[PDB]
Amino acid sequence: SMNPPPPETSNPNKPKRQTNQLQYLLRVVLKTLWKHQFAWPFQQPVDAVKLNLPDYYKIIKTPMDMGTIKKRLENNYYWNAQECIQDFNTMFTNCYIYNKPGDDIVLMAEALEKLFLQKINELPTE
Numbered sequence: 001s002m003n004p005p006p007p008e009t010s011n012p013n014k015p016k017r018q019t020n021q022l023q024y025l026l027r028v029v030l031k032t033l034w035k036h037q038f039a040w041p042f043q044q045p046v047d048a049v050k051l052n053l054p055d056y057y058k059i060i061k062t063p064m065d066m067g068t069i070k071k072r073l074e075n076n077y078y079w080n081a082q083e084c085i086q087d088f089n090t091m092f093t094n095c096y097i098y099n100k101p102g103d104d105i106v107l108m109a110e111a112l113e114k115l116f117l118q119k120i121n122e123l124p125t126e
């Protein structure tokens with residue numbers, strides 16, 4: 001029983017770019033979530049082996065985590081802000097899908113998502 005490879009943090013075939021919205025996403029949006037008290041289960045790829053979740057990667061076929069996003073932003077992996085927002089959005093949704101609606105993790109993701117939404121209200125005009 002094995003974990004999949006984590007999502008790529010670089011691809012030499014994918015065009016790279018820095019935008020003031022991607023800078024804002026790293027310096028502000030990601031710093032804000034990363035430092036949160038509820039950030040810890042989302043700072044890395046979901047370890048199905050270590051966590052005892054043999055069904056996790058049968059259900060969630062597009063995993064994403066903030067460690068992957070942070071590394072993506074640091075390597076200019078994204079072309080635009082929408083790409084990154086999407087990865088964040090995937091992360092949240094993944095959590096919503098797999099967990100029972102009253103699990104603690106679900107409440108944590110909701111707390112991080114409302115924070116996410118607040119922060120991206122001040123995303124610069126590109």
Ligand SMILES: Cc1ncc2n1-c1ccc(Cl)cc1C(c1ccccc1F)=NC2
Nearest residue numbers: 040041042046047051095098099104105
């Ligand atoms: C992301 C994610 N989706 C599903 C899981 N997780 C998760 C990931 C990492 C860690 Cl350290 C715990 C959990 C936890 C978890 C988090 C907080 C409280 C209890 C838990 F089982 N559950 C499995």
